Amino acid sequence: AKSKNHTAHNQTRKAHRNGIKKPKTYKYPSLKGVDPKFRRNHKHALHGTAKALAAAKK
Amino acid sequence: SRPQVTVHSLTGEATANALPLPAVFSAPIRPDIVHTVFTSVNKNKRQAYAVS
Amino acid sequence: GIDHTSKQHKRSGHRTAPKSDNVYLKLLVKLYTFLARRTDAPFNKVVLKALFLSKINRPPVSVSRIARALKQEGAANKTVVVVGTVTDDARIFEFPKTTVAALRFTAGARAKIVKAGGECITLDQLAVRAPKGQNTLILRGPRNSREAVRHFGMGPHKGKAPRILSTGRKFERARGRRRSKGFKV
Amino acid sequence: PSRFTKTRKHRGHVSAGKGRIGKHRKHPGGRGMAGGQHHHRINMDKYHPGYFGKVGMRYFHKQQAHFWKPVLNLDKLWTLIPEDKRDQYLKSASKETAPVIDTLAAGYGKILGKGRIPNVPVIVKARFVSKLAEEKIRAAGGVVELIA
Amino acid sequence: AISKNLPILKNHFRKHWQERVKVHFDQAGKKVSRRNARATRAAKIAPRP
Amino acid sequence: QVWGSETVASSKVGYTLPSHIISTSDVTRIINSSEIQSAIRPAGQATQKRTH
RNA sequence: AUAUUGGCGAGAGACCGAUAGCGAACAAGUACAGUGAUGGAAAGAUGAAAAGAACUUUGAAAAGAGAGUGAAAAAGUACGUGAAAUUGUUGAAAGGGAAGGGCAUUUGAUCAGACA
RNA sequence: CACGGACCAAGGAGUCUAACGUCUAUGCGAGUGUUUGGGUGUAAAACCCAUACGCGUAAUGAAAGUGAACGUAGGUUGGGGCCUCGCAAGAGGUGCACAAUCGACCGAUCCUGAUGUCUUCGGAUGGAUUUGAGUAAGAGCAUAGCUGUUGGGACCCGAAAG
Structure with a gap:
């Protein structure tokens, strides 16, 4: 009583019903995986530049 | 001022007595609410029935 | 036959009109289907579709959030609009004057607003005061602060807080939630 | 109502x-x-991560009384005053007269610090407090009496 | 039978639980039996309250 | 006294009569007014000539 | 104070309405089956009232056929209404190894509406 | 040339409930739930109500335990709407919800370890490619309905057995 095991038929056709949606990619991507050493400094770069205007903006 | 409903005697014959509206009579009129509350409240006097 | 790039006879997925049977509700839906049509200003067209929103899509706008939007620059003279219910926030110990127009106020937020020399309005009087919407702020309450949305999209590594009856030790903290027993997530 | 069910559409x-x-x-x-x-x-x-297995210590004969410690943030803590008397204390806020708020009378076990009471001196009776809770109270001009 | 995303539910019906069901239909019929017996005893016991 | 009013309160503990979510129940009375018929644009013919 | 599908006596229902409701609306734990333990049905309805057909004739009788009773025997103790399968009679049409169906119109029978 | 069905009438199959998920309507709303009970009544209805209690408003660790603002409750990109200018087109001001993203805050784990002290207690401060079902101007509670699930005879009928 063997069965029919594998087939790819209909799978590409089911795939295009809702059809291969895109990244929906964003400005400002996630910093997951970025260099921790760069990322530490980047904290304080932004941390300082926000206060940079806090001296000008008042 | 309220509309001043007028008082009627038992022979007919209304009278110099005229009363304000209680302001329960100004409340919103909600036939969907009354319908939902009735349908539930009307179920509160009932008896069980079950086959043996 | 025709070869369609789309699915036929497919509705737009919107509220054309409320699902409520409320009578006084439909009198505003009747009032703003008229102004949305003939008044050419988008404010009326925004307030209309906000009368069709369900309850879960109508979170309440606390009387504190109303005070932020007034601190917002230039808006201290505007008439804030809330399609929804205004609720009380006593965590603010001062409140401005201004005006509010909403469907429903809670008894607390009615006092607080009246307490400061301000005024509570309905939507119908707003339509009469500013049909176009002159000098108004619409404000929405937070939608994703619900208890159910906290559970949406549960699955590995998504941090979505499983739906569960009882919270504490011994309920689904063990295998798969920590490295020591089995794995983590 | 069974007239609304869908097996009365499946006939x-x-x-x-x-x-x-x-x-x-x-x-x-x-x-x-x-x-x-x-x-x-x-x-x-x-959808059920953590179901199987054992975490920590058993507790024999546990009673939720010992563990009763309701928490009241400094967010509220002025709600415990009568709203008729309350605005008497906000205005004309001085020492030698300060509102005594018994938080155990209202069923609270600990006063937390979540945020910003006003500048009015207030006497707060509580069983437990937090390190930030008093700093904001004590800097408001009031004090925390401990009770049992 | 475990499906979808649902809270686990412990519901203890695996005994024979329909023998032991107690429905109270007399909640309002025992309230007058209880207000009687208090007015019975209010009179029996003399001005003793 | 039973349902209260603005002056006298309740006699029912923790209760006050409901509020209107619209001031006036006559919708066509609002739709005329002044300020609305001032902002309203001139109407069509209420039925459209079939063209073509 | 609590419990109660037994017992006695009571009041009730958005309950079932004789293939339902208890197994049992009736002479129902009955008739019947089994060595026994046990098993266990079917079965409501003339009319307001028997006023339940005197009397005549054919027939050995049952009944028939008239009269008679009744608001009605198109209610005759086979009895309220009396469906369907199925059947007898009459009338109509049809028929070359099935029958029956759809579209179309002729022919036969019928039907209003309408006009005026 | 698979199975059931000669025919007719009548019965005949996704129900109730306990506990919940989403969704919708309704009342109130930082609360909400009168009905275990008491008052009362035209009497199983309706009407009125004290105390608690349940969920919610605080999370986090096995636990002992501790417990949410550096700031207009922050910054940046985008945002309906409103306001200003302009004949308009459009630009500028403000920007709710919401999506992305970097910070600050509370708890747990590892690291540092202050003025101080019953000399080993206390834990200030400062961290970290760490971790949480968290904060960051509350939204839940109650009833009703659809659909879905779990336990129950469980949509109906059916075993060999014990």
Whole structure:
């Protein structure tokens, strides 16, 4: 009583019903995986530049 | 001022007595609410029935 | 036959009109289907579709959030609009004057607003005061602060807080939630 | 109301919404949570992470009395005053007269610090406090009496 | 039978639980039996309250 | 006294009569007014000539 | 104070309405089956009232046929209404190894509406 | 040339409930739930109500335990709407919800370890490619309905057995 095991038929056709949606990619991507050493400094770069205007903006 | 409903005697014959509206009579009129509350409240006097 | 790039006879997925049977509700839906049509200003067209929103899509706008939007620059003279219910926030110990127009106020937020020399309005009087919407702020309450949305999209590594009856030790903290027993997530 | 159910729309259709191939039968996946390690595993993982196993110490004869410690943030803590008297204290806020708020009278076990009471000196009686809770109270001009 | 995303529910019906079901239909019929017996005893016991 | 009013309160503990979510129940009375018929644009013919 | 599918006596229902409701609306744990333990049905309805057909004739009788009773025997103790399968009689049409169906119109029978 | 069905009438199959998920309507709303009970009544209805209690408003660790603002409750990109200018087109001001993203805050784990002290207690401060079902101007509670699930005879009928 063997069965029919594998087939790819209909799978590409089911795939295009809702059809291969895109990244929906964003400005400002996630910093997951970025260099921790760069990322530490980047904290304080932004941390300082926000206060940079806090001296000008008042 | 309220509309001043007028008082009627038992022979007919209304009278110099005229009363304000209680302001329960100004409340919103909600036939969907009354319908939902009735349908539930009307179920509160009932008896069980079950086959043996 | 025709070869369609789309699915036929497919509705737009919107509220054309409320699902409520409320009578006084439909009198505003009747009032703003008229102004949305003939008044050419988008404010009326925004307030209309906000009368069709369900309850879960109508979170309440606390009387504190109303005070932020007034601190917002230039808006201290505007008439804030809330399609929804205004609720009380006593965590603010001062409140401005201004005006509010909403469907429903809670008894607390009615006092607080009246307490400061301000005024509570309905939507119908707003339509009469500013049909176009002159000098108004619409404000929405937070939608994703619900208890159910906290559970949406549960699955590995998504941090979505499983739906569960009882919270504490011994309920689904063990295998798969920590490295020591089995794995983590 | 059974006039609204969908099996009162399924009159006349053979299989009553349960499908003609898989039919509908008694218990296909076993009773209840059966097979939770075995054929339902993919379900338990994702939507019940942590189900199996043991975490920490047992506690014999536990009583939730010992553990009763309700918490009241400095967010509120002015709600405990009568709203008629309350605005008497906000205005004309000085020492030698300060509102005594017994937080145990209102059923609270600890005063936390979540944020920003006003500048009015207030006497707050509490069983427990937090390190930030008093700093904001004591800097407001009031004090915290401990009780039991 | 475990499916979808649902809280696990412990419901203890695996005994024979329909023998032991107690429905209270007399909640309002025992309230007058209880207000009687208090007015019975209010009179029996003399001005003793 | 039973349902209260603005002056006298309740006699029912923790209760006050409901509020209107619209001031006036006559919708066509609002739709005329002044300020609305001032902002309203001139109407069509209420049925459209079939063209073509 | 609590419990109660037994007992006695009571009041009730968005309950069932004789293939339902208790197994049992009736001479129902009855008739019947089994060595026994046990098993266990079917079965409501003339009319307001028997006023339940005197009397005549054919027939050995049952009944028939008239009269008679009744608001009605198109209610005759086979009895309220009396469906369907199925059947007898009459009338109509049809028929070359099935029958029955759809579209179309002729022919036969019928039907209003309408006009005026 | 697979299975059931001679025919007719009448019965005949996704129900109730306990506990919940989503969705919708309704009342109130940082609360909400009168009905275990008491008052009362035209009497199983309706009407009125004290105390608690349940969920919610605080999370986090096995636990002992501790417990949410550096700031207009922050910054940046985008955002309906409103306001200003302009004949308009459009630009500028403000920007709710919401999506992305970097910070600050509370708890747990590892690291540092202050003025101080019953000399080993205390834990200030400062961290970290760490971790949480968290904060960051509350939204839940109750009833009703659809659909779905679990336990129950469980949509109906059916075993060999014990």
